[PDB]
């Protein structure tokens, strides 16, 4: 009756709040602004949820909601903004940045390694030996039982005699080159910890000082 | 002891005849049979790709030994001339004016002694003794007249029916001066001659011959060395 | 069994005509043609 794309559906029963969620995030942003101190600006990064939970553990709360939603709730104009001189702070407020309550030394120094993501550049030129696959690139003192990985890899490999074997060596990563999705997915099965979580503490919206520096 | 099939048939004795001086293979089918025979006897004795009377049962139509060869009456002049040209000079060929045309079925002959169909003609018996230079004896095998088809002969061993008795076994061995064993070829087929062709130093049987049967033929023919 | 109208039978018949199996007809024609 009409050439239109089909919209499949499932039985998840986990529908989101949408506008209600945005309103709740705005209310939480206002509460975080009204919170006591420590005036942090850091919400998330390429790090995993486990890293975010670990960071939140050293606090008594990291929360930003949708990016620029809290900035819109606060307001670019100082009259709408709860803080002072927030006109310049709103422009700097981009990406995943949020407040917390618990610090500076841990954020500056403690940067746990994590699996890399696409778009960045690999720290070196990772290569994979030919023949049977190596789980840890020779660091395992490495089972070859990843038979389903032979079908799900797409690399030049053939499942011979129940063991995934690569006909020729394939360089997974190259130094100075942007990481693609295929390279990132291939490196996910290996130990490529090319990441370093960071935080931003340029300024602090103190109750008395009210000096949000841009250092 | 080797296993071979002419075309897709277990009967190689019917389609070929083997002696201690030459080999004969059927013509017009697949030469894979000729190829197999040449692979084991090409450097020893000549192999002739021949037919007898425009027919491929040359094994059961012609009987011979290391000395001479016999052909039936129905053998054409061209084929007889072909056989003479192919075979070497020290081998003689003879036409037989025998009523029983199937020479390979009525005569089982080794290099020294031959046992023949009981009702063979006297003139046939005399020319057999003249050409083959063997002692000829009229007797039946397990009460069965077709000696050439129901018994296989070599210089050092021979086989007969499993239906023969022990006293018949002893009498046949005594009259042939060669060890004789009651056995079967091609997995229970009692046509030993049709399923087996043997010279004094090698043996050919059908591919359907059992391992036990091959061991029996090897044991009687002393072909391990 | 496939007939003569078979497209396969036509195809390998064409393959026979594409090779030396018809070259015995070319030189055959050339012999009378020259003489």
């Amino acid at each position: 009756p009409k050439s239109r794309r089909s919209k499949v559906l499932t039985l998840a029963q986990t529908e989101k709040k949408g506008h209600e969620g945005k309103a709740a995030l705005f209310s939480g942003v206002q509460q975080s602004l009204d919170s006591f101190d420590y005036m942090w600006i850091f919400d998330v990064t390429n790090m995993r949820n486990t890293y975010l939970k670990r960071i939140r553990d050293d606090w008594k709360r990291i929360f930003m909601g949708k990016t620029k939603v809290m900035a819109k709730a606060l307001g670019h104009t100082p009259e709408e903004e709860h803080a002072e001189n927030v006109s310049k702070l709103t422009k700097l407020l981009h990406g995943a940045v949020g407040l917390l309550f618990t610090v500076i030394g841990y954020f500056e120094s403690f940067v746990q390694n994590d699996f890399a993501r696409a778009g960045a550049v690999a720290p070196f030129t990772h290569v994979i030996p030919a023949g049977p696959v190596y789980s840890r690139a020779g660091q395992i003192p490495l089972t070859h039982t990843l038979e389903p990985q032979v079908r799900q890899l797409g690399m030049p490999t053939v499942l011979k005699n129940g063991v995934v074997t690569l006909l020729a060596d394939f360089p997974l990563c190259t130094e100075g080159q942007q990481l693609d999705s295929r390279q990132t997915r291939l490196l996910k099965l290996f130990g490529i910890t090319a990441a370093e979580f960071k935080v931003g503490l340029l300024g602090y919206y103190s109750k008395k000082g009210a000096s949000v520096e841009f250092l | 002891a080797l296993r071979a099939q002419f075309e897709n048939s277990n009967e190689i004795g019917v389609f070929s005849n083997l002696t201690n001086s030459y080999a004969l293979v059927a013509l017009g089918g697949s030469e894979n049979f000729y190829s197999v025979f040449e692979a084991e006897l090409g450097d020893v004795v000549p192999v002739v790709h021949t037919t007898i009377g425009g027919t491929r049962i040359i094994g059961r139509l012609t009987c011979g030994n290391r000395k001479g060869l016999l052909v039936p009456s129905s053998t054409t002049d061209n084929e007889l001339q072909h056989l003479r040209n192919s075979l070497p000079d020290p081998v003689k060929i003879q036409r037989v004016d025998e009523r029983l045309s199937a020479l390979g079925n009525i005569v089982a002959c080794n290099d020294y002694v031959a046992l023949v169909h009981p009702d063979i003609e006297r003139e046939t018996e005399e020319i057999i003794a003249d050409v083959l230079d063997v002692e000829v004896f009229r007797q039946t095998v397990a009460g069965n007249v077709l000696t050439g088809s129901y018994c296989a002969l070599s210089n050092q061993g021979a086989l007969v029916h499993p239906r023969t008795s022990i006293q018949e076994q002893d009498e046949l061995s005594s009259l042939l001066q060669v060890p004789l064993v009651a056995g079967t070829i091609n997995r229970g087929s009692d046509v030993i001659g049709a399923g087996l062709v043997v010279n004094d130093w090698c043996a050919f049987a059908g591919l359907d011959t059992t391992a036990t049967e091959l061991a029996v033929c090897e044991s009687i023919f002393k072909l391990q060395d | 069994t496939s007939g003569p109208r078979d497209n396969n039978r036509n195809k390998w018949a064409k393959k026979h005509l594409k090779k030396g199996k018809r070259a015995k007809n070319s030189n055959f024609s050339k012999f009378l043609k020259k003489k």
Binding site: - | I57, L146, S149, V191 | -
Partner: protein, 138 residues
Amino acid sequence: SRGRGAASGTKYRMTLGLPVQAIMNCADNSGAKNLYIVSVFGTGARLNRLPAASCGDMVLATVKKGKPDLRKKIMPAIVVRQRKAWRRKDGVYLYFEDNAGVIVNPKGEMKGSAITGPVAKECADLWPRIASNAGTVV
């Protein structure tokens, strides 16, 4: 599979002279005397055409006269001799003076042991077992 079962070679077209209902002589030493033709293998769909056999053809046979235990089986039979004259492909015309045949299993090795009388070479070539156990092959 019975139709061309263990033939070890194709047969040339031969004059048919033994149709069904034919009565014909047993040629082996198994003990049977006479055979009655019931059907012939490899006959297609020809309207009103009486099924017929030639030398070396395999037929369904009933032992009309013979040993009782040889009977009560519709047994395959190989027509080895035929009275009707037929053209051998080399050109000569042949005809044996009686119609003879042998009792054989479907595989192609007979129950008999020795054939009394002449054997057509066409029969002996499609059936190496008959050739192996034949006495005179013409």
